[PDB]
Amino acid sequence: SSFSGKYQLQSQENFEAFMKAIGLPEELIQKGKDIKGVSEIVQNGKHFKFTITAGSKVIQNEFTVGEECELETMTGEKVKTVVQLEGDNKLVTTFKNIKSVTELNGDIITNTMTLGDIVFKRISKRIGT
Numbered sequence: 336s337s338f339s340g341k342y343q344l345q346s347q348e349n350f351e352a353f354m355k356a357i358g359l360p361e362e363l364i365q366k367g368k369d370i371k372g373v374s375e376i377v378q379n380g381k382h383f384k385f386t387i388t389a390g391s392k393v394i395q396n397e398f399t400v401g402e403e404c405e406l407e408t409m410t411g412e413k414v415k416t417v418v419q420l421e422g423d424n425k426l427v428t429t430f431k432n433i434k435s436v437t438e439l440n441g442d443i444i445t446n447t448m449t450l451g452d453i454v455f456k457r458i459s460k461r462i463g464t
C-alpha cells in the first residue's frame with residue numbers, strides 16, 4: 336500500500352497552457368487554475384483506486400498495474416491504457432500522447448504530465464489519514 340493516502344496540491348506549473356491544449360473548456364480552467372485539489376489513493380497490491388477532487392469536479396478512477404484499464408481524464412474523455420510501476424513509488428502511463436509520471440517521496444507526491452514541450456507539474460502533500 337505504498338501510495339495509499341490523502342494528498343492536497345501545494346503548487347503546480349503550466350496548468351492553463353496544458354489544460355487549454357487538451358481541450359478543457361476555458362470556464363473550467365479559469366475556475367480551476369488556483370484550486371488546491373485533493374487526491375485520495377487506495378493501493379492494495381497491484382490494485383489502485385483514486386479520486387481527484389477539484390472544486391465541483393470529482394474524478395474517480397481505478398486500474399490494475401500492468402493490465403489494460405480505462406481512465407477518465409481531465410475533459411471527461413475515457414482512454415484505454417496501461418499503468419506500470421517503476422519501483423514501489425512511481426506510476427507511469429501514457430494516453431493521448433501525454434506521458435504521466437506520478438512519484439511518491441515520503442509524504443510528497445509529484446505528478447509530471449508531458450505533452451510535447453509542455454510539462455505540467457503538480458506537487459501535493461499528504462493531509463492526515
Ligand SMILES: CCCCCCCCCCCCCCCC(=O)O
Pocket residue numbers: 363364366367372387389390391392409446457
Ligand atoms: C466549479 C468547480 C469546477 C472546477 C474545474 C476543475 C478543472 C480541473 C480539472 C483537472 C483536474 C485533474 C488534474 C490532475 C490529474 C493528475 O495530475 O493526476
Ligand SMILES: CCCCCCCCCCCCCCCC(=O)O
Pocket residue numbers: 373374376385387394396406407408409418426428435437444445446457458459
Ligand atoms: C485525470 C486522471 C489522469 C490519470 C493520471 C495517471 C493515472 C495513474 C496515477 C494515478 C495516481 C493519482 C495521483 C494524483 C497526483 C495529483 O493529484 O497530482
